[PDB]
């Protein structure tokens, strides 16, 4: 029966579901008695009528019983939304680009266009500009922002030159860069003695804060690290273990680049780079 | 005017331009989704 079944099968479905992964065999896996054509006509009109749904992935065809404010809703969907609109829910939890889309639908960039703006007024999508190239603003769900992506703009050489600061704390004392010696002398008592450094701690270190942002993983502290490795402002020892380059004499014959100044003006006697290129 | 007629007249304003000041109140609305 239309409203029997309907609301029986959606009994399972508002009960279970069998999760998304329902399919038609699960339905006879649980209510077997409709015959075909009986279980059939009446899910095909829980579409029409807007009760359970189907998703197209891997073997058969997932379904479940849609909610009753995203019934209507998708009723209130135009044709183009129809598809579109429950295929962007379809998109997941990374969202679609457009024309992928068109590719999906067979349709011009105008007709898309349009219903972008549609379930644009229905904010139930939104512009989403993830990692990848920004010509995208791929379109899922208005309700979820989930993606990959610290973030890809800057302020990460503040943070950086934060903790570099406390890196070079953990080798020996402090800077005593006043006069030339004023280092540990001898290293306190044998260097060797000491096998140091943060990784974890670094954290409990960042719980100092002072800025804009969550905490961040040990791997991607290991990361953070890693720059400063190959921008050579510390040292990589036995894994977790660091040290620091002893960089702040460039912070502060002659090799180093900086406490290097040129004439570099008038005489032609200098040394460019590319004076033969 | 009387207060009366401003509470006719303006009555009438009102519902009549309801559905533009609803406008207005709802994308103020979207202003508080726009954050999210």
């Not at chain 1, 679609?96 to 349709?107: C, G, V």
């Not at chain 1, 510390?234 to 004439?263: G, W």
């Amino acid at each position: 029966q239309l409203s029997d079944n309907a609301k029986t099968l959606h009994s399972q479905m508002m009960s279970k579901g069998i999760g998304a992964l329902f399919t038609q065999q699960e339905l006879q896996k649980q209510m077997g008695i409709g015959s075909l054509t009986d279980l059939m006509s009446i899910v095909q009109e829980l579409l029409d009528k807007n009760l359970i749904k189907l998703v197209k992935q891997n073997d058969e065809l997932k379904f479940q019983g849609v909610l009753e404010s995203e019934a209507q809703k998708k009723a209130t969907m135009s044709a183009e939304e129809a598809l579109v609109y429950s295929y962007i829910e379809a998109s997941g939890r990374e969202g679609i680009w457009s024309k992928t889309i068109k590719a999906r639908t067979n349709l011009h960039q105008h007709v898309v266009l349009k219903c972008l703006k549609s379930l644009e007024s229905q904010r139930y999508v939104k512009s989403v500009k993830s990692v990848k190239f920004p010509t995208r603003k791929i379109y899922m769900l208005y309700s979820l922002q989930p993606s990959v992506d610290e973030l890809d703009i800057e302020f990460i050489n503040s943070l950086l030159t934060i903790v570099w600061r406390f890196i070079s704390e953990n080798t020996f004392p402090n800077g005593f860069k006043n006069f030339e010696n004023g280092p540990k002398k001898n290293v306190f008592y044998a260097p060797n003695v000491k096998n140091y450094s943060t990784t974890q701690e670094i954290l409990e270190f960042i719980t100092a804060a002072q800025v804009a942002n969550v905490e961040l993983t040990p791997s991607n502290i290991r990361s953070l690290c890693e720059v400063l490795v190959y921008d050579d402002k510390l040292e990589k020892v036995t894994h977790d273990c660091y040290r620091v380059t002893l960089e702040s004499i460039l912070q502060m014959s002659i090799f180093n680049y900086f406490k290097m100044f040129p004439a570099s003006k008038h005489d032609k006697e200098v040394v460019y780079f590319d004076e033969w290129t | 005017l009387n207060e009366e007629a401003s509470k006719l007249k303006e009555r009438i304003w009102i519902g009549l331009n309801a559905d533009f000041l609803l406008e207005q109140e709802s994308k103020r609305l979207k202003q508080e989704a726009d954050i999210a």
